[PDB]
Design a protein around this ligand. Structure first.
Ligand code: NA
Ligand code: NA
Ligand code: NA
Ligand code: NA
Lengths: 255, 255, 255, 255
């Protein structure tokens, strides 16, 4: 039912600047009793898409209502137009997500057990989610890409307002086969027998990335990596992501 | 040194409503390194005066700059026009301060040792400070009333905009000898051998409460309770409280 | 179409303290061109229920998403446990809503035309909505009480956490025939031919206030005051108010 | 004097993302009476330095206290590590400042007369201030660079945490004689007789940029452009900028 909505602005050693972060911290009885041990909460790292920021899930969905119902802490960082990369000409935004993870688990009552930690996000943030799932599989038991970009070239080549592809990839001529390519990261994770979080992939059938989502899950099936895929009516918008994140939160906290 | 500025809004079980709270949390390297143990911070509970709220210290002083310099966490709650009382007709705002104290020490990396915990505030908040110092002396090693109301009639009889004295005290003819009277609370602390935090009492010489402050320290001297009193040029305003809280923070963290 | 989410804290002359307010301001191209006259937006005054505040509609609904779709500015004030009254022992919160109305229409590009201004709210805020609709009908063309208290005793006699009925009504043993009684305000508006905003009344069938809603619309029918009533599955919670305020916004903005 | 502190987050068409902005809006009578035309305020565009953001002036200075004393609205945008440039690989942050100027003058009661509009900022923001002063002289009657970078090479060649010079200037081997060079902007302003805002230049004597400031004012003297230069004890920190912005605000409004 009740929780805390928290806005934090701290000077990040990784990206060299003050940066805003938002946190949903559902209430627990132990948080109000100085005689009892704090019960650490299950925790979701939740990644915004391109043009969104740390405020937009709160504004355009009812995520705090869903999170409070399931006692799930939610961490919402801001990564600008970075695509969750350590940018060639810009900020170290991949490392920044690792810093945020460590920081909030140190200063808040969040469980540090892998089974209690999840990651999710939409569009550019679903791309970010799969990138972290395949390279930081020891940190998250479950990962939920929503309406994700899996073929990196479609996001690097998109002509969105003020977006600079070169800020991210620099001198790279293509992203295929680089750290920016989720298919390469997947091949590397399997080849090196890394832990892959349990995967729930969701995408609206009217989304322009729907075919891209179908291509990725087919490849997952061909390399014997399990996943759950949920589709249905929905487009590339927060009307879909509001309903999708509600369904995702129920899925992540039940197992 | 850098820190986090934190804005929290949570549903309070004590006062039955969502309520904002602000927190300054200076940064420590242990907060970013998952391999080391988090070092708990010294903590100040800082109480606003009448017409102010949880935002006004940040807005009208440079308090976060001072706190960051001394690695001091600062907790700034909102108690409206309550005078930090469990109100006759209103909210349980005395109890709320205790709830805020417990909550932030549970969810944040704040030291729970009495020697690491301080309380301070100006005007109505200096009245609140002395009330908590004399009734919750086990929670604070030091207390700093700034420009405080010590003779409770001086606060209750004020004709400030929209302020209701009866909301606080109900039908009481006088507050002398009641839980609203710092002189009664002081006599009772002495009589019951309660621990009294170290007192630093500050007031500007042009403050209309200056004589009220001199009367209180005169009484403290007459009952052999130690204190440090600092005055000088200054009035009943945030220009004075900015400089006073700066000098107070240095005093509380040294020794 | 996106917009601005605004958090404002100003010292109120009416309530004698700093208070927080939240505003949703959808974007118009006139806002970005210094050569054109700003186009004023339709504006909704949205009132929270008991235990909520200025943040809770944003946190527990997708109201900003709905408002942006319909280019509707939304004003969300905080009135604590006041029931939108000028309190017997407390603050002038009825007058405060009038001050907020004037203030935001002055400092923001909001239409001052009656036909462009609406008011809505749930539970205690639906009680507030009907009180303002029946006493300030010249300020609002439409009013939408959601899950409202219409029989004031149902609100006052509530044993809600930390709630003080006497702070609001003083020593009164009944509220019938007073400014706290919507039925009296309705009788007085009908008798004096006041402008009554066009009325849309919504309540969930599982809400404990559902019968109170049926009683009020039954009275409206007996006295030939027009209204639209919409019910259906739903309880006394933000899951219902999220859906209801989306439906209400669509109703206000068109015809 | 009391005012509003405003935090806004809107989706910017220029930079293609949600972005936070803070505004100080001192109160005026007309703001509380909707029957009158609102009175427009004098307005200052205040630009942060490297590693700061839209929150840091509020947090580390008492700027709102100073602004309220002089009924000066203050606009504090966020421009990250951009150096206020339209970045070679990044965002169009020069255009963004112009968008913010137009946006806040449309939606808030801000005077559009050149004589009522000022710009100021420290370090990277002092560099930004002089760039806008020399290229947008029709928008600002006065400009106040604080501890500014005037020799652009010292900012671009800085080795600050996560800072990318290439993101700003691309492969350029020097910035001399370019739009990133204040001396070139100065020569072109003088050559084309464009109006130069009245200049107040301040820097602390212990600042590592002090000589850079001395070089710039010497050049202004040699090309017969007036200025007032104020130095004194002070370093490259917010202890200095707090006192400097207080002195600057008194100068701007008094004219
Ligand atoms: Na995206
Ligand atoms: Na006071
Ligand atoms: Na209610
Ligand atoms: Na700088």
């Amino acid at each position: 039912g009740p929780g805390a909505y928290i806005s934090l602005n701290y000077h990040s050693p990784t990206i060299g600047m003050h940066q805003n972060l938002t946190v949903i911290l559902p209430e627990d009885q132990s948080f109000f009793n100085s005689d009892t041990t704090v019960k650490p909460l299950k925790t979701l790292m939740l990644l915004h898409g391109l043009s969104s920021d740390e405020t937009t899930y709160m504004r355009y969905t009812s995520i705090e209502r869903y999170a409070n119902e399931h006692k799930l802490a939610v961490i919402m960082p801001n990564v600008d137009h970075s695509a969750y990369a350590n940018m060639a000409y810009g900020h170290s935004y991949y490392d920044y997500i690792l810093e945020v993870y460590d920081y909030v688990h140190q200063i808040f009552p969040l469980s540090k057990k892998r089974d209690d930690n999840f990651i999710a996000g939409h569009s550019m943030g679903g791309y970010g989610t799969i990138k972290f799932a395949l390279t930081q599989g020891d940190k998250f038991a479950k990962a939920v890409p929503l309406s994700a970009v899996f073929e990196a070239q479609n996001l690097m080549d998109l002509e969105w307002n003020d977006f600079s592809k070169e800020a991210i990839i620099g001198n790279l001529s293509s992203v295929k086969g680089t750290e920016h390519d989720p298919y390469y990261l997947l091949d590397k994770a399997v080849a090196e027998d890394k832990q892959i979080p349990k995967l729930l992939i969701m995408c609206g059938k009217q989304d322009f990335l729907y075919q891209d989502n179908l291509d990725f899950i087919d490849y997952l099936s061909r390399i014997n990596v399990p996943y759950q895929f949920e589709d249905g009516p929905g487009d590339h918008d927060y009307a879909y992501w509001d309903q999708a994140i509600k369904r995702a939160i129920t899925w992540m906290v039940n197992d």
